[PDB]
Amino acid sequence: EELREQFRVEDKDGNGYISAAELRIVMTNRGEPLTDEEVDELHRETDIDGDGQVNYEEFVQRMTA
Amino acid sequence: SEEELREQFRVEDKDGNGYISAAELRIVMTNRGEPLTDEEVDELHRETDIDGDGQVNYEEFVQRMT
Numbered sequence: 122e123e124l125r126e127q128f129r130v131e132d133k134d135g136n137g138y139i140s141a142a143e144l145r146i147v148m149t150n151r152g153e154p155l156t157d158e159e160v161d162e163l164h165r166e167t168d169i170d171g172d173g174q175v176n177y178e179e180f181v182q183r184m185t186a
Numbered sequence: 187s188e189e190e191l192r193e194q195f196r197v198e199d200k201d202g203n204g205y206i207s208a209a210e211l212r213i214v215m216t217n218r219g220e221p222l223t224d225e226e227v228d229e230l231h232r233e234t235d236i237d238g239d240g241q242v243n244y245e246e247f248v249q250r251m252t
């Protein structure tokens with residue numbers, strides 16, 4: 122579905138997680154100038170279970186906002 | 187030693203997710219009074235981040251420190 126496809130676009134190495142670096146790429150491509158350190162905090166906020174990675178369920182939870 | 191490296195990793199990994207972010211390294215350097223700009227902090231972090239995921243794990247921390 123559309124959420125699955127968007128997750129796949131943001132997951133560059135295809136390991137099922139969106140990393141901080143992959144989130145930086147997302148924000149760059151959205152034309153949102155964010156510093157690396159700011160993206161770090163956005164990544165942390167998205168990482169509900171605190172394993173340091175954004176999985177698909179966490180991506181969906183944020184996209185539902 | 188492993189015990190000292192683990193202690194230092196835990197100090198830097200404030201949010202406890204198993205990684206040190208550039209934002210966490212910024213906090214580390216400011217708390218130490220290290221005269222580094224944000225760009226310099228972010229550059230050090232990029233140099234430490236061997237695998238490029240934007241996140242410094244314990245292995246990469248040890249590699250930089252040893």
Ligand SMILES: [Ca+2]
Pocket residue numbers: 128129130131132133134135
């Ligand atoms: Ca992909």
Ligand SMILES: [Ca+2]
Pocket residue numbers: 132133134135136137138139140143
């Ligand atoms: Ca990935």
Ligand SMILES: [Ca+2]
Pocket residue numbers: 168169170171172173174175176179
């Ligand atoms: Ca997670």
Ligand SMILES: [Ca+2]
Pocket residue numbers: 198199200201202203204205206207210
């Ligand atoms: Ca951390």
Ligand SMILES: [Ca+2]
Pocket residue numbers: 235236237238239240241242243246
């Ligand atoms: Ca890394």
